[PDB]
Design a protein around this nucleic acid. Structure first.
Lengths: 328, 128, 47, 91, 61, 335, 90
RNA sequence: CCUGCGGCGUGCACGUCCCAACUGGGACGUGCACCGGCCGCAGGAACAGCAACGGAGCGAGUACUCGCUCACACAU
């Protein structure tokens, strides 16, 4: 569940560890720490901007800090990840997340067949030049003309694109290529990273109702449905499980060292962003791998990974470094 | 029959003509054969004419293997706005071109003798 | 508005501009309701 | 005014009041960069650069007594050699 | 050319000179397409190949 | 469970473990996760040879397409013969010689001048040409080459044309085999077509790609700056050494081996059981990179029961020099 | 000068006279063959067969016909135009 | 002593024409490939070290710098 799924499928380096009574499961945290270590998959309304739709959430939830992982235009709806407090540490890591939009385009003139539009979308694929709207290279992985109305000359196409892509510029370029011109009259982000419309999307009314139910009834069911743990944003990251005695060292800036790895996952390459996970499923930190999986299966000591961004707070687990077999 | 014959064709055999359109295409090629320079037959000649800029309707054979010998030409036709369509078999194209030997694909130009049919077929494809 | 949708057997969003889906049922709009912070109808909506 | 000129590329098609030129030189032109003829005759200014990173196009907004039906197939377009960047720079 | 083949259940090539395989389908030519080093149809080949889900990148493994 | 790990890490857990103590270095990449420049420079292509050109033409065409300094090939297919053709790219070219002795499976079409009694006659004639046969090059130092197996896949009597599949040793000329089979049947015969169906451990199902595939991958990498096509086309050179016994070495001994140092016991992490003296083995890093090809001078038991002595003698250094830092001479005994 | 027994007649593939070999030495290319009476009947055309049990096809002059020899006919070859078998062995 | 590197008129493809398949023929132009031993250069002469003195968390300025705090951790 979240980050222990298929843990037996991972390579086991050792089972022997001394469990500690500290820490909480990612999904069983108290209500005061669930919100601080959570993110919301907001269905952005049409008019308000993203920084004002995030200020609304901050004011609503009475949280000290709140961020988001991609700016949606004032007139653009779709997925919006709002990280709450302790989750904001992940915002930077979320900038490169692949996006998926569904755009509506109106053409100034008419085309002979839907095949013309399909071919035009076909040639607007791969790495493409984009200029921010009123020169960079950004990749369109896929596209698909979902619908087209000739009388209205307005069509719907779903596009998989890289973070930072301007769908306004892409629609303008689709107009230019087809010899008739065109521009975008509507946009809606349908997936943001590993999160989409099916993956627990909540309206702003839903957040308001949850916070209200919490205040006037002390019921945390709705708020837990609305807010998800940050571990759900790193499910696509490769994992390196460390023992309960090594978590705090990582939390203080120590590099991940081989003697403390309880389990590691196949497919770890040097200079690869990984997630340090405790034995309960919490996310200790994001690290950069300095050893391939084979180099870890074949060594007894060293630095398995260096830190990139510590997620867990200090003193969550007790200080237990310096009490090893040697202690010399 | 025809459904089986279309079954044997490759997956890239699209757009495909139905049976009635197949008879119409065979009629068009047979009528166009009477004019030496107004019908182009073979892979190399068709490709060269497309390169130069010649226009018309291009008729492919959907039962060909390997597909890498012709898979690119549908896109060239698309690029130059030349209608094209597959047909069930190459033996049929040969039989329609007055040559028992098969032809992988063919290119038909416009002539005043058979303009009506040649533009009925064009319209029929454009509606597919 | 322009973007509408329906759902298939798997509950996936199929995007169309048509007011009637292939199965005859109306298509649901793809955009959420407009939000106003000064909304005092939480209890009524919950009820 | 143009001390020197180099062939920017060839002609593409027309989209309303714009002239798409298919760029052959790898160098990526500047924005608002005047496009000249063979005889150092500016004909328009750059508006949009679009397409992939090695086969791309550029639209020009003919302004001074220039039109789209004036030019014809196979025509070539020039640009000031000082108004370019290396393709690598953007990439 | 002469050589042709049909694919069995396991996916192996069963070579034969016949035009029609025992299953009634045509037999695929054994030989690859001729190559011209000055081949300017790579773009035109990836659009169609992708369009029909046959390119190598689209296959599993 | 390392039975599914790529290339030279297969059954890595089953290898005998000499030691677990060393300090890994951050230099190098996994064979499959290399940069594109190094991936191309250290790669090979299994190419369905087109019918018309010669093997040298195919290699030069690949050179021009991929813009690589050096490229080579193991077995030469006549101009009119298609099939498997392993082409090395700039650094697998050092493994071309090791691929020259690889086994070869062909499928050949033959025509007999005059009709034979029945198919069983052809079957017996083929069953008589399976051994250390006698072969003289076609249009002259008569050689002896082996034909392990052979089978008459098809025989059309109306045209008197048959198709047979032959497994044979490198250098064997199947045109000579066809003329000899013709002589054997009492009617004479010749070869019409030939198609190499396997070159070593590489065959038709083992990721064979066409020249069009190479050209398209190059275009996709040079226009869309995409690498997946070129990575499906080119494969790491370690795929050519998957049949070799493996000796894993510490990262401190890699540069020494590159400079010419013999593979010494104090720097061996793991080895594959079954290594005999004067056997060709592959010295590998813990990342899976084949540093070199060596000739063993120690048995598995000796390697388990010894503390010093030269474990292997260099035959071909594959890894580029200065890829790893110089760490020879800082140990206790070395000083 | 002298001759030694090469083997016995097998079949004839057109002009080529196929001779089975009973000796353990492999002859040369175009090495002349001669009958009992040291009469030249042709030159070696091809060498084929298994390493030990092998055959040689010989091309004859207009001086002879392949069918001219009956089953069991024995052949003679020069002992000075043979190679050691150990040479061609690995 | 070891290693690495270098030397010791046919076909193919393309373009254009004549004729009589996913073709074989010709002519005219382009490119592309071919018809074990010795020597020279360079690198190293290698028994394979290194179980922490540069990381983390905050605030400010223009990926870098400037300050504070925490530890400087091989995980029994």
């Amino acid at each position: 569940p979240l980050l222990l799924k298929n843990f037996d499928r991972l390579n086991v380096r050792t089972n022997h560890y001394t469990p500690l009574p500290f820490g909480h499961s990612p999904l069983k945290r108290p209500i005061a720490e669930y919100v601080k270590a959570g993110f919301i998959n907001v269905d952005k309304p049409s008019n308000p901007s993203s920084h004002e739709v995030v200020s609304w959430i901050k004011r609503i939830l009475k949280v000290e800090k709140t961020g988001h992982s991609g700016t949606l235009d004032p007139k653009v709806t779709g997925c919006l990840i709002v990280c709450i407090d302790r989750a904001t540490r992940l915002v930077k890591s979320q900038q490169n997340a692949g996006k998926e939009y569904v755009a509506v385009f109106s053409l100034h003139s008419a085309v002979e067949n839907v095949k013309k539009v399909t071919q035009g979308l076909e040639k607007l694929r791969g790495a493409l030049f984009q200029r921010p709207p009123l020169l960079r290279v950004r990749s369109v992985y896929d596209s698909k003309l979902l619908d087209f109305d000739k009388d209205r000359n307005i069509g719907v196409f779903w596009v998989s694109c890289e973070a930072g892509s301007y769908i306004r510029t892409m629609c303008v370029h689709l107009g230019l290529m087809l010899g008739v011109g065109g521009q975008m009259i509507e946009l809606r982000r349908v997936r943001s990273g590993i999160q989409g419309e099916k993956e627990g999307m909540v309206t702003m009314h839903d957040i308001l109702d949850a916070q209200w139910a919490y205040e006037n009834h002390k019921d945390e069911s709705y708020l837990r449905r609305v807010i998800k743990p940050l571990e759900g944003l790193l499910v696509a990251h490769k994992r390196i499980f460390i023992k309960d005695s090594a978590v705090n060292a990582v939390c203080y800036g120590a590099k991940v060292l081989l003697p403390g790895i309880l389990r590691y996952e196949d497919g770890i390459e040097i200079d690869q962003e990984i997630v340090i996970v405790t034995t309960k499923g919490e996310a200790v930190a994001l690290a950069i791998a300095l050893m391939t999986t084979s180099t870890m299966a074949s060594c007894d000591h060293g630095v398995a990974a260096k830190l990139k961004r510590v997620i867990m707070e200090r003193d969550t687990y007790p200080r237990k470094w310096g009490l090893g077999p040697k202690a010399s | 029959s025809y459904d089986e014959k279309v079954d044997h064709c490759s997956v890239i055999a699209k757009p495909m003509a139905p049976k009635k359109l197949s008879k119409k295409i065979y009629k068009l090629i047979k009528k166009s054969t009477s004019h030496k320079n107004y019908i182009r037959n073979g892979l190399k000649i068709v490709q060269k004419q497309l390169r130069l800029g010649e226009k018309g309707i291009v008729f492919f054979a959907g039962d060909i293997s390997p597909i890498e010998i012709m898979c690119h030409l549908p896109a060239v036709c698309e690029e130059k706005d030349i209608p094209y369509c597959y047909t069930p078999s190459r033996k049929d194209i040969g039989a329609a071109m007055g040559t028992m030997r098969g032809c992988v694909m063919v290119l038909v130009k416009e002539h005043d003798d058979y303009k009506d049919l040649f533009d009925e077929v064009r319209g029929e494809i454009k509606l597919l | 508005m322009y973007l509408r949708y329906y759902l298939n057997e798997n509950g996936d969003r199929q995007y169309t501009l048509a007011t009637i889906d292939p199965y005859g049922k109306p298509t649901i709009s793809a955009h959420p309701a407009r939000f106003s912070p000064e909304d005092k109808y939480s209890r009524h909506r919950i009820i | 005014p143009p001390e020197s000129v180099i062939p920017l590329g060839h002609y593409g098609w027309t989209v309303q009041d714009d002239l798409i030129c298919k760029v052959d030189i790898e160098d990526v032109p500047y924005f608002n960069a005047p496009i000249f003829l063979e005889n150092k005759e500016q004909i328009g200014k750059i508006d949009e650069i679009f397409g992939n990173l090695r086969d791309y196009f550029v639209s020009v907004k003919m302004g001074d007594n220039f039109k789209a039906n004036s030019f014809k197939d196979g025509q070539q377009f020039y640009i000031d050699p000082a108004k370019l960047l290396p393709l690598k720079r953007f990439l | 050319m002469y050589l042709r083949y049909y694919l069995n259940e396991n996916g192996d090539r069963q070579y034969t000179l016949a035009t029609i395989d025992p299953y009634g389908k045509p037999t695929i030519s054994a030989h690859p397409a001729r190559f011209s080093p000055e081949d300017k149809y790579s773009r035109h080949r990836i659009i169609i190949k992708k369009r029909f889900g046959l390119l190598l990148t689209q296959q599993p493994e």
